[PDB]
Amino acid sequence: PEQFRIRRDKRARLLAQGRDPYPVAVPRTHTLAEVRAAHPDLPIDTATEDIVGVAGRVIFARNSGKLCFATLQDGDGTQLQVDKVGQAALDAWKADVDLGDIVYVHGAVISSRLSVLADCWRIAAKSLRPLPVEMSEESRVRQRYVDLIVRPEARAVARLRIAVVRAIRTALQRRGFLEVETPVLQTLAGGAAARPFATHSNALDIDLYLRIAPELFLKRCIVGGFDKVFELNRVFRNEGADSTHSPEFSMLETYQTYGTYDDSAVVTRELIQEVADEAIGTRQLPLPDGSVYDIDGEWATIQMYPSLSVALGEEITPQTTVDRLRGIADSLGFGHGKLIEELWERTVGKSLSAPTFVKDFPVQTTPLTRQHRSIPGVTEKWDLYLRGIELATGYSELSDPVVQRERFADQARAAAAGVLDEDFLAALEYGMPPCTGTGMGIDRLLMSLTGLSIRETVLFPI
């Protein structure tokens, strides 16, 4: 609290002295990593004539006499510690240097009874705030910058999420997918059931809506002649937060002409497995529960109605009235579809461990997905539940316009108190070849793979 001020003192009396604590440039030559990787086994307490210039953060100090010792930590986490040139050197070192301070050092590299000793040295930046040694998982998230410095785990994760996301891109691109960019500000926001964030434009004297999802535009792409498209990026759903939900988040969507939810469920499996392999290296996923979640080999596929039927010891179908459902609903603790999914989730959903697609969903609650090819009353959507998390949905995509138009009229009357995406429908009545969309949640993906909270999967939330 106090030593805040002391650090400011130390800054001032380096300006007026004309030494620079925020130098433009400082001729670093190697990363601590690069040093390590060059010099694995050096005979301890022998020397080598590799001059280098390295920068780092002083995190351990042990100042004593003619000689000070200190740990330098590259930002990536790597570590290298530190007669030679000048006593004034030592006095500045002793008097000027605190911890959390960024420091360049020149010199040759040696083994300690692996450090370096100084031709030159200089401050690259003066911290006017000492690093704390514990911090609340909440304070942590509010100051990720410190987290990242002091807490290793923050580092690896941040890097992982990145590694994963590269993995995804690598994979889709290997399969001949083209990443596209579609609007975020939209005249009306479609592609999912969520309340949008609305904002005012000065330029058009109108409101605008942050995209809850890209599907409608991504579809317009397929129309326009895209074989295979994805768009990995952020969506905004104006609603509550919870372990699995957060109002802005990063989402994959995917679309493949000439293929069905059967095929896309396959891709989605391989996709996820490739990711694990690229970014983690095992399909036997370690967890803070000491446990290991296996995701290798093949994954089960069950139907919603069937699997639910077995669960309630009773046949349930598209046919089953609301009253029956409602009643069964009560026996345990709006409309048909909503009840089926509720019941399904509430019974079969919860119970699952290993990786499982469910498929064949109540039409009532899947207006964008095609009617099932043989079975009446249902659509060709899957969900994919992975270690007990709804991670992804695939669809055989509703290409028919008039069906689709109807699909909305019903949805629309649903919340009336007395406007459709006419352009989207225009799009469809130009032709849209058969295709299967997926959607996947990137935090849930990591969460599902790791057991980390949604608050740890991303750099900066609130």
Ligand X SMILES: CCOc1nc(N)nc2c1C(=O)N([C@@H]1CCCC[C@@H]1O)C2
Ligand Y SMILES: N[C@@H](CCCC[NH3+])C(=O)O
Number of neighbouring beta carbons within 10 Å of residue 361: 25
Residue 274-313 contact track with its own copies, rule CB under 8 A, x = bound: ----------------------------------------
Pick one of 87, 139, 187, 282: the residue that binds its own copies (CB under 8 A). Answer: 187
- Sign for the CA dihedral angle at 258, 262, 267, 268 comes to positive
Instruction: Look at strands 228-230 and 248-257 and give their pairing.
Output: antiparallel
Which residues lie closer than 8 Å to 113 by C-beta, 6 or more apart? 44, 45
Cα 440 to chain center, whole Å?
11
Residue 438: name its binding partner from ligand X, ligand Y, its own copies, none (Cβ under 5 to 8 Å by kind): ligand Y
Q: Count the site residues for ligand X by CB under 6 A.
A: 14
Nearest to 72 by CA among 62, 57, 61: 57
Residue 438 touching ligand Y (CB under 6 A): yes
50 annotated ligand-binding residue = no
Q: Least separation, in Å, of the C-beta of 195 and ligand Y? A: 14
Judged by CB under 6 A, the chain residues 420 through 449 that form the site for ligand X are 439, 441, 443-444
Residue 253 touching ligand Y (CB under 6 A): yes
* 428: its two tokens: 């469809």
Nearest to 432 by CA among 424, 440, 421: 424
Q: Least separation, in Å, of the C-beta of 276 and its own copies? A: 20
Residue 437: name its binding partner from ligand X, its own copies, ligand Y, none (Cβ under 5 to 8 Å by kind): ligand Y
Residue 381 touching its own copies (CB under 8 A): no
Task: Give per-residue burial for 373-398: e unless 16+ CB within 10 Å, then b.
Answer: eeeebbbbbbbbbbbebbbbbbbbbb
Residue 250 touching its own copies (CB under 8 A): yes
Residue 249 touching ligand X (CB under 6 A): yes
Pick one of 107, 259, 337, 437: the residue that binds ligand Y (CB under 6 A). Answer: 437
Query: Which region, judged by CB under 8 A, interacts with its own copies, from 109-117, 163-171, 285-293, 313-321?
Result: 163-171
Complex with its own copies: residue 224 or 286, whichever CB lies closer: 224
383 annotated ligand-binding residue = yes
Pick one of 256, 393, 396, 404: the residue that binds ligand X (CB under 6 A). Answer: 393
* 93: its two tokens: 């070192």
Residue 392 touching ligand X (CB under 6 A): yes
Q: Least separation, in Å, of the C-beta of 329 and its own copies? A: 28
Query: Which region, judged by CB under 8 A, interacts with its own copies, from 118-126, 284-292, 299-307, 326-334?
Result: 118-126
Which positions make up the binding site for Mg(2+)? 383, 390
- Name the site residues for ligand X (rule: CB under 6 A): 237, 239, 245-246, 249, 251, 390, 392-393, 439, 441, 443-444, 454
Binding residues: 383, 390
Interface residues with ligand Y (CB under 6 A) are 191-192, 213, 215, 253, 393, 395, 397, 437-439
